[PDB]
Amino acid sequence: FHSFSFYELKNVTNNFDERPISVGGNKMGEGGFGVVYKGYVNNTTVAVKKLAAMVDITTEELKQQFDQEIKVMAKCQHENLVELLGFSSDGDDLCLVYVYMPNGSLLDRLSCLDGTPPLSWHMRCKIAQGAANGINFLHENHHIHRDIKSANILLDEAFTAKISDFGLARTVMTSRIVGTTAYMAPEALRGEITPKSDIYSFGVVLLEIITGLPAVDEHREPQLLLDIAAAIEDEEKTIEDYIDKKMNDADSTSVEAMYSVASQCLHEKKNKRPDIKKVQQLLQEMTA
C-alpha cells in the first residue's frame, strides 16, 4: 500500500487512453463511478480506477466512496477479494490502484468478450464457490457489499474469483438508494441496508453463471433474468431450456443443484433466504 503521484498513474496509462487494449489503448472497462485503465508501476501490471461521477452523484459522494474503499480494503488480503495496492489524490482526479486481474470480469468471460473461450461448468462451479467465500469473509466482518454482480467479480491468472468495488460497502434504512437495479433485492430498492440483499444479488449471479445471459437485456423477452427464474418456478419455462449451450461438461444434477441455491437466494422475502454460510455449504455439496 502506497500513495502514487497522479502523474505516475497518468504516465503509465498512456495519459488515461480511453481506446480499448484491442486498438492499442489502456481502457479495460468502466462503471457508474469511473473507468478502469491498464498500467505498469513497481515493475508490475496494475489496474488504475480513475474515479468520476458518470452518474448523478456529488463529487463529495465520489470522495466518500474513495475514502470508504481505502478504509475497508487498505490492509485486506483474502483469496477471494481484490487487493488494493494504493491511491492518488494529489492531482486532477482521484485514483485507486489494484493488483491486475488478467481474465477481467465474470460478466465479460460469460459473454466471451474479445473472443475469449466460454468458461467450462467446472470453472463456473469453482468461480461460484470462490465468490461466495469472498462474500462470507465480508459478512463475517459485518460488511454489506451493496453491489454484488458479475461485473464486480474479477478473475486472476488461475480464474480464482475476486470480489471488487467497496465504494458503497457498509435492518438499517437509507434515503440514498444506490446499486444495480437488474441485481437489487426488492428491500434494497426500498432503501434497506442488510447482508440479505447481497445474497439476493448473488442469486442473480448464479443465474448468469448457469445461463450465460446478462441480468438485463433490453432486446430480450423477458428483459430481466430474475423474471426467467420466476417463469421457471411457475412452470412456464424450464432450467434445461436456459442452461448455457456454450459448455460440453455440464450435468443436469449439479446445474439443478446450483439453480436450487439461486432460487433460495432469490426468495422475495429476505428472511426466507439462506445466509452466506448456508450458500457456501450447498455449493460445496454440489461438487461432492
- The answer to whether residue 49 forms part of the interface with ligand R6I (CB under 6 A) is yes
In angstroms, the CA 230 to CA 246 distance is 23
Question: What nine digits make up the cell of 122?
Answer: 467446472
- The answer to whether residue 114 forms part of the interface with ligand R6I (CB under 6 A) is yes
- Single out the segment in contact with ligand R6I by CB under 6 A; choices: 100-108, 177-185, 186-194, 250-258: 100-108
Tell me whether residue 152 is annotated as binding.
yes
Question: What nine digits make up the cell of 68?
Answer: 470508504
Nearest to 135 by CA among 87, 226, 202: 202
Number of helices and strands in the chain (H, E): 10, 10
Q: What are phi and psi of 9, to 5 degrees?
A: -65, -45
The radius of gyration of the chain from alpha carbons, rounded to an integer in Å, stands at 19
Tell me whether residue 49 is annotated as binding.
yes
Tell me whether residue 166 is annotated as binding.
no
- The answer to whether residue 154 forms part of the interface with ligand R6I (CB under 6 A) is yes
What one-letter code names the amino acid at 254?
Answer: S
Question: Which residue in 9, 35, 41, 47 binds ligand R6I (CB under 6 A)?
Answer: 47
Question: Which residue in 26, 80, 88, 105 binds ligand R6I (CB under 6 A)?
Answer: 105
* Per-residue mark of binding to ligand R6I, 160-199 (x: CB under 6 A): ----xx----------------------------------
Active site residue ranges: 147
Closer to ligand R6I by CB, 212 or 274: give it.
Answer: 212
In angstroms, the CA 271 to CA 201 distance is 15
Tell me whether residue 173 is annotated as binding.
no
Check residue 248 and give left, alpha or beta (phi > 0: left; psi -120 to 50: alpha).
alpha
Find out whether 167 and 176 touch, Cβ atoms under 8 Å.
no
Question: What nine digits make up the cell of 211?
Answer: 445461463
> What's the closest the beta carbon of residue 213 comes to ligand R6I, in angstroms?
19
> What's the closest the beta carbon of residue 36 comes to ligand R6I, in angstroms?
4
Interface residue list for ligand R6I (CB under 6 A) = 28-29, 36, 47, 49, 82, 98, 100-105, 114, 116, 154, 164-165
- The binding site for ATP comprises 28-36, 49, 149-152, 165
